[PDB]
């Protein structure tokens, strides 16, 4: 029936809310009003889906949630992980988009922003498992999630990343992960955990769900005891240079997977050799762009608004090849780095920059159809 | 000891709220965050003020309110007018900025957008009065407002208009004044009349003030009987081509007043000869710009976002002279039309376009100081 033999799963980044979990008024994550990725690709005969995972949680938590979003079942973060970081072991339960997912039935994974990192970690778990959970279950018995066992291959065909901070971002180090802004983020999470809330911002495993008979005052008191306030097990930490390097250090290339990256630049060189945001950078990224663009290290300056070029091209010290727009992107086991998209800021990739008239719907349609063509090529050359 | 002998009164347009009457979060009308007109001009030693008049009412109602804002006292719309249109005769009461205002003590009037029309009408009333009110008080006795008497000269030194729709706008004819959008406007007025409201949107004379012990249900029922819903005595009507022509037809040049206009363009010619909004036009004016720019009559196309050039230059039936940036603007009795400001949309005149980095604070400062210099020169050449 579908043109693509393997389902495409699109994985949103940090802050992203999709589908039923998006607020009453809120942008459509995958394509804005410019090109409705899920709906349009379906109309054209492709089998595609948008994952829904934690908007504020760690790559770890998100990767576990991604697994269950696909397979179905009750999210299990692992006994060792839960005990180490101080959050619930078990989380939400998903219906599952492919309940028969197993070695032999493959999926294509495309990640925007942090979605790119989350995808890598989950493949890591399928192939190699999670050593601390393996050790924990050896020592103490119990059940261990099949996600943490290792030895599950032939499950992902491709990893494509768009504006992913593979090497982290200074906008995290110098803003997102500061004490003041973690508190803002966590307060937002506390609030949207109130008993009248219909949206899940992705930190309920830390206690941010008010009980039906609990007063707001008691709720405040209870969740102020949570480890979230001081933990590194959250998105803010993971998006830092250190946080991203840690993930780089525990990932490896899978020789059967087709890897490809896209990167935008939306800054220009000023006097002194610093980078400033172009007119047309979505305005909410103006200051973050300046922070990145005024780095002491010249090669860390050019950026898409919130992620520097050098972070998006590929994980540093993993094998890559610079590739053309025209040739097949069909090499396995190596990061195929696509030519930089000039004038594309971080959110132009997902079409939500309603202020930017240079970035047209028809252009974004071509961009997505291009990705699908590459995916079709991957299928054709097994 | 102010540098200017005559006080400068700035008069906002349609939708504008100022001072204490602005919502919790709302732009600073005169200068945005780019150049604080009132505060900065005061620091430099000028006596300036921002009038506060109805945001949604007619030029008539606004012009009465302007009079009382300056002179002080209880707003009196006139018995004949009240009876003809179906609203209260009396309105709010103002402290007065110049309680001694009379022939001999003059004021300079500068109006943005509809503010420009309001200023013309008020001076018309001072000089020539209101014949229907004169006739009504002849027939029925009682008190008549001094504003309606006629014979008051030597009270206004200058009339300067910025992006004023002297000849109306299609954005009114084809949108603002349609049935569906009048209802939206009136509903907003109804709501902001509720008993917890601290802001006056300028239509309480029509009944839109909920009583302290009245239920919302009863309020809805009462104000649905108001004539507002079908009247032309409102801003939406007055901003139309017909509405503006009517005002033109009943105003005249005062030979002792210095008249000057400014106009912006923020559209560009497309291949068919239609006008489209520049990048940089405040995005809320995007559609209104297209509507104006696709007019059948070519000379009605170029626009500032919501006002076509032909409308802003000067009232079409009144004398004008095209003037240079450098000529002293000291001619009396004729509209001195200042050269068009390229790239300035409707709201760039008041500095509220936070999305437009090409329009800097220092530019806006020069523009306002320019106006003051012209006003100073009007004083110097009596
Ligand atoms: C996904 C991740 C990359 C961003 C790295 C920068 C961290 C700065 C944090 C600011 C904190 C605000 C409380 C990007 C997904 C974008 C989706 C959207 O804009 O809706
Ligand atoms: C003052 C007058 C220019 C109005 C032109 C035409 C009417 C368009 C309809 C809008 C519909 C309302 C729902 C402009 C002063 C603007 C001030 C501000 O935006 O703060
Ligand atoms: C639009 C932002 C509104 C202002 C936020 C102030 C409240 C700070 C933190 C609130 C925490 C909570 O309600 O649980
Ligand atoms: C005493 C417990 C407090 C309950 C949570 C407060 C929720 C605030 C917002 C609710 C909005 C609504 O009810 O529609
Ligand atoms: C941004 C808020 C928009 C909500 C619009 C719905 C309300 C329609 C009419 C309400 C009239 C009234 O409450 O008197
Ligand atoms: C009979 C009901 C009349 C009062 C309803 C007015 C609605 C205003 C809501 C604003 C809430 C507040 O700040 O109290
Ligand atoms: C402004 C808050 C309104 C709803 C509060 C519900 C009360 C409760 O939790 O018992
Ligand atoms: C040059 C070595 C590449 C791997 C061979 C894959 C065979 C195929 O085309 O299915
Ligand atoms: C909840 C408060 C709403 C304020 C409406 C202001 C409209 C205007 O700009 O004229
Ligand atoms: C959602 C409405 C909250 C305010 C209650 C109105 C009070 C009253 O007039 O009785
Ligand atoms: C009430 C709206 C929630 C904000 C969701 C976000 O910023 O990801
Ligand atoms: C133009 C802005 C209006 C919003 C008014 C408020 O939320 O208080
Ligand atoms: C002046 C306000 C008009 C809003 C119309 C639009 O957003 O297309
Ligand atoms: Ca952009
Ligand atoms: Ca502008
Ligand atoms: Cl499995
Ligand atoms: Cl929730
Ligand atoms: Cl008088
Ligand atoms: Cl009021
Ligand atoms: Mg919901
Ligand atoms: Zn965790
Ligand atoms: Zn009236």
Tab-separated table of C-alpha atoms in Angstrom, chain B residues 62-193:
chain	number	residue	atom	x	y	z
B	62	UNK	CA	-13.255	62.423	19.507
B	63	UNK	CA	-13.121	66.128	18.535
B	64	UNK	CA	-15.443	67.048	21.387
B	65	UNK	CA	-13.335	64.947	23.745
B	66	UNK	CA	-10.129	66.647	22.485
B	67	UNK	CA	-11.659	70.054	23.305
B	68	UNK	CA	-12.406	68.995	26.903
B	69	UNK	CA	-9.048	67.230	27.270
B	70	UNK	CA	-7.439	70.637	26.626
B	71	UNK	CA	-9.889	73.070	28.239
B	72	UNK	CA	-11.095	70.867	31.116
B	73	UNK	CA	-14.730	70.075	31.992
B	74	UNK	CA	-17.587	67.651	31.319
B	75	UNK	CA	-17.727	66.373	27.724
B	76	UNK	CA	-20.847	67.672	25.932
B	77	UNK	CA	-21.525	66.066	22.526
B	78	UNK	CA	-24.471	68.433	21.953
B	79	UNK	CA	-28.204	67.882	22.441
B	80	UNK	CA	-29.015	67.759	18.723
B	81	UNK	CA	-26.160	65.298	17.984
B	82	UNK	CA	-27.057	63.040	20.946
B	83	UNK	CA	-30.716	62.999	19.902
B	84	UNK	CA	-29.917	62.388	16.214
B	85	UNK	CA	-27.531	59.445	16.793
B	86	UNK	CA	-29.041	58.010	19.987
B	87	UNK	CA	-26.320	58.299	22.644
B	88	UNK	CA	-25.745	60.165	25.883
B	89	UNK	CA	-25.320	63.919	25.559
B	90	UNK	CA	-22.747	64.034	28.379
B	91	UNK	CA	-19.587	61.964	28.864
B	92	UNK	CA	-16.433	61.852	30.981
B	93	UNK	CA	-15.036	64.879	32.736
B	94	UNK	CA	-11.424	65.962	32.245
B	95	UNK	CA	-9.125	67.954	34.539
B	96	UNK	CA	-7.936	70.068	31.587
B	97	UNK	CA	-4.341	70.636	30.523
B	98	UNK	CA	-4.828	74.354	29.812
B	99	UNK	CA	-7.879	75.608	31.808
B	100	UNK	CA	-7.252	79.169	30.517
B	101	UNK	CA	-7.381	78.265	26.809
B	102	UNK	CA	-9.124	81.094	24.886
B	103	UNK	CA	-8.490	83.308	21.764
B	104	UNK	CA	-4.938	84.594	22.256
B	105	UNK	CA	-3.490	81.523	24.017
B	106	UNK	CA	-2.587	79.048	21.288
B	107	UNK	CA	-1.713	75.364	21.061
B	108	UNK	CA	0.120	73.265	18.429
B	109	UNK	CA	-1.796	70.141	17.363
B	110	UNK	CA	-0.068	67.049	15.982
B	111	UNK	CA	-2.149	64.035	15.009
B	112	UNK	CA	-1.155	60.507	14.001
B	113	UNK	CA	-3.510	58.599	11.703
B	114	UNK	CA	-7.135	59.402	12.604
B	115	UNK	CA	-5.736	61.881	15.155
B	116	UNK	CA	-5.137	64.117	12.101
B	117	UNK	CA	-8.841	64.160	11.157
B	118	UNK	CA	-9.952	64.720	14.754
B	119	UNK	CA	-7.766	67.798	15.029
B	120	UNK	CA	-9.258	69.313	11.854
B	121	UNK	CA	-12.853	68.833	13.045
B	122	UNK	CA	-12.202	70.382	16.427
B	123	UNK	CA	-10.667	73.540	14.945
B	124	UNK	CA	-13.604	73.682	12.510
B	125	UNK	CA	-15.950	73.790	15.533
B	126	UNK	CA	-13.980	76.513	17.290
B	127	UNK	CA	-13.915	78.759	14.191
B	128	UNK	CA	-17.356	78.135	12.638
B	129	UNK	CA	-19.284	76.300	15.426
B	130	UNK	CA	-21.905	73.578	14.852
B	131	UNK	CA	-24.985	74.889	13.063
B	132	UNK	CA	-27.336	72.079	14.204
B	133	UNK	CA	-26.444	72.786	17.836
B	134	UNK	CA	-26.860	76.538	17.313
B	135	UNK	CA	-30.316	75.946	15.726
B	136	UNK	CA	-31.366	73.450	18.422
B	137	UNK	CA	-30.497	75.843	21.290
B	138	UNK	CA	-32.238	78.699	19.418
B	139	UNK	CA	-35.380	76.544	19.280
B	140	UNK	CA	-35.325	74.973	22.754
B	141	UNK	CA	-33.188	77.136	25.097
B	142	UNK	CA	-30.836	75.491	27.627
B	143	UNK	CA	-27.029	75.622	27.662
B	144	UNK	CA	-24.826	75.318	24.568
B	145	UNK	CA	-21.171	74.262	24.688
B	146	UNK	CA	-18.702	77.095	23.828
B	147	UNK	CA	-17.216	74.578	21.373
B	148	UNK	CA	-20.345	74.839	19.228
B	149	UNK	CA	-20.751	78.656	19.249
B	150	UNK	CA	-18.293	79.627	16.474
B	151	UNK	CA	-16.148	82.788	16.386
B	152	UNK	CA	-13.140	81.356	18.277
B	153	UNK	CA	-9.888	82.153	16.443
B	154	UNK	CA	-6.292	82.452	17.491
B	155	UNK	CA	-6.495	79.240	19.509
B	156	UNK	CA	-4.514	76.829	17.355
B	157	UNK	CA	-1.137	77.745	15.841
B	158	UNK	CA	-0.572	74.634	13.746
B	159	UNK	CA	-2.035	71.397	12.468
B	160	UNK	CA	0.453	68.657	11.624
B	161	UNK	CA	-0.711	65.193	10.509
B	162	UNK	CA	1.297	61.917	10.247
B	163	UNK	CA	-0.099	59.139	8.038
B	164	UNK	CA	-3.597	60.629	8.396
B	165	UNK	CA	-6.234	59.117	6.025
B	166	UNK	CA	-7.534	62.528	4.891
B	167	UNK	CA	-9.290	60.798	1.946
B	168	UNK	CA	-10.173	57.553	3.762
B	169	UNK	CA	-8.855	54.015	3.291
B	170	UNK	CA	-10.075	50.939	1.442
B	171	UNK	CA	-9.002	48.968	4.506
B	172	UNK	CA	-12.046	50.574	6.129
B	173	UNK	CA	-14.422	50.254	3.163
B	174	UNK	CA	-13.546	46.607	2.529
B	175	UNK	CA	-12.802	45.377	6.055
B	176	UNK	CA	-12.943	47.736	9.063
B	177	UNK	CA	-16.460	48.976	8.329
B	178	UNK	CA	-18.034	45.662	7.309
B	179	UNK	CA	-20.862	44.232	9.440
B	180	UNK	CA	-18.816	41.297	10.745
B	181	UNK	CA	-15.916	43.463	11.953
B	182	UNK	CA	-18.039	46.205	13.481
B	183	UNK	CA	-19.653	43.450	15.560
B	184	UNK	CA	-16.203	42.285	16.721
B	185	UNK	CA	-15.247	45.862	17.671
B	186	UNK	CA	-18.532	46.445	19.513
B	187	UNK	CA	-18.334	43.146	21.392
B	188	UNK	CA	-14.820	44.129	22.596
B	189	UNK	CA	-16.286	47.448	23.758
B	190	UNK	CA	-19.125	45.614	25.518
B	191	UNK	CA	-16.690	43.330	27.295
B	192	UNK	CA	-14.301	46.094	28.355
B	193	UNK	CA	-17.346	47.848	29.831
